[PDB]
Amino acid sequence: AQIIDGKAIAAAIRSELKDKVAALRELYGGRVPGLASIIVGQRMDSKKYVQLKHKAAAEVGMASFNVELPEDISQEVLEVNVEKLNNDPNCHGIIVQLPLPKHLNENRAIEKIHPHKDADALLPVNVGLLHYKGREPPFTPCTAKGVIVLLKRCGIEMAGKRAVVLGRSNIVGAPVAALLMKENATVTIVHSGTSTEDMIDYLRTADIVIAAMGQPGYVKGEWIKEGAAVVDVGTTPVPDPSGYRLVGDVCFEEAAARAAWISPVPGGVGPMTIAMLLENTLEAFKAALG
Amino acid sequence: SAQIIDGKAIAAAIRSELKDKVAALRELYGGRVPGLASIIVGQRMDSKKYVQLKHKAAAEVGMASFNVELPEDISQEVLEVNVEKLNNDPNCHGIIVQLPLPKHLNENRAIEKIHPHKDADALLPVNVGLLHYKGREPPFTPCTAKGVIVLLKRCGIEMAGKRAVVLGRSNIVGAPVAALLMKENATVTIVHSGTSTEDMIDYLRTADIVIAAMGQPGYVKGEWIKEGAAVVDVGTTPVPDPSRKDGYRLVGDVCFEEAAARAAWISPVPGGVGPMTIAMLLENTLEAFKAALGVS
Ligand SMILES: [Cl-]
């Protein structure tokens, strides 16, 4: 199996964005793209991703606006802070770090984000534009965009191929399936309603497999078609060593013995999703002054 | 042999149910009633006929009807103004623009003017988004798409835990119905122009449900259908075979008589969708009126 090096590929894209952003700074005053990120409650998991997200933003020479709010916050306040970032012309990309507190309604908060700034592509209007044939959205969900880029960059054919997507999530599973189809892959989406032996039968002939269920060590190598490509989007924290570890959905050592390609975890689609968020933001800024 | 999914009858039953529901809401809410509004531009006899049929169905159920007929050579701006008038008309709950418009007008732009909550055909991206958004329900589902799922539910055809193949990925039927089946927990594969014939056949071999939406007359062979499967033929294409007035008959994607020997359930063309689509347009419009009042 060929290790799909997302860390390397993303490193290449990050530099391409830095040099692109540098050029635009010369052409348009002291202006640079802005990446905002609201966080409700001091959640340990989400705090880490935010630190990594603004690091790459700083590494590519973008502005970062990290809003943090406490746990016991009313919806009105959360929606005011989003509208603040909407009216801020120095902020071009807005994301709300899920998962929010149970008492807060995520849907109605995300709805407040302007369509031209919805950098994570979570607004229904952006989800629709994606799925609608003959219409292309302002943004694509980062993880799904990344998976396709790793597919193209590695020279992996999607036209006329059989594709199984494990998971139907709004962030990864659904959008990747829609995009794989847009590349003339014949896609089947597996999920909790699917029986295990159905899953395995779909996997039996799958040329491309996307593990986006988010359950560590679920996909075994025996299911993967010999000569297929497997993208492990799963990235759940396990507390085994030292003080945490990032294990994915695919049983790597099993799947590597059969698949022609395999994305590892860590160092797979994780750095891609960050790169795509920046590229989205960069494209967001380029739209504002195109 | 396979049993015949009588879509015509099912739709008839639904129109009766809507009629009663609309009559029940009248008593409770001051004699108020749902309004289905349409906009047609120019004078195409195809578009005029379609619009009559929808408005007649709306009359049978006791809904109000709003037909706006604009000239063929009218401005985009002026069309959109009339669309905005309907948006701000509380007597009107559903709004459809009859397609295709004249070439000089922009359709997607005229449709974008419609308020998301009055988009009876579910043509707006935001409604398409909500339809695909796992964990949210759209105010409207695409009519033909929704009526295919209701055909199944009403025949007692299980979707959850089943394998399904949607032949075709068209915006108007294929794509939406594929997501509705997944939402119903069927495991769905969408076959399309990029799909190999051998794979298409392989997928169909295990398909408990099959939705024929490619638009190719008589191409799904009966032997490809899994023994006991449910087949919904949504494709419709005229052919010059039959000695008849007009010299044609509508023929579906599926070879019916072949599919009947293997399938448990099937919907023939004619009998596939048709009055279901219009029925689903009325149900969509009821939900809008039900929503606009505050009733769940
Ligand atoms: Cl699921």
Residue numbers in the entry:
A (entry chain B): 4 to 245, 249 to 296
B (entry chain A): 3 to 298
Quoted from the paper:
The asymmetric unit is a homodimer and subunits are labeled A and B. The first and last few residues (1–2 and 1–3, 297–298 in chains A and B, respectively) are disordered and an additional three residues are disordered in chain B (248–250). The LmDHCH subunit consists of 298 residues displaying a high level of secondary structure; 11 α-helices and 11 β-strands. The substrate-binding site is at the other end of the cleft. Analysis of the domains of LmDHCH from the crystallographically independent chains shows a significant pivot around a hinge (residues 150–152 and 274–280) with a rotation of almost 14° evident. The subunits appear in distinct states, with the active site slightly more compressed in one than the other and this may represent a feature of DHCH activity.
All trypanosomatids possess this dehydrogenase and cyclohydrolase activity with a cytosolic bifunctional enzyme (DHCH). The cytosolic DHCH activity appears essential in L. major since knockouts of the disomic copies were not possible without ectopic expression of FTL to provide an alternative route to N10-formyltetrahydrofolate.
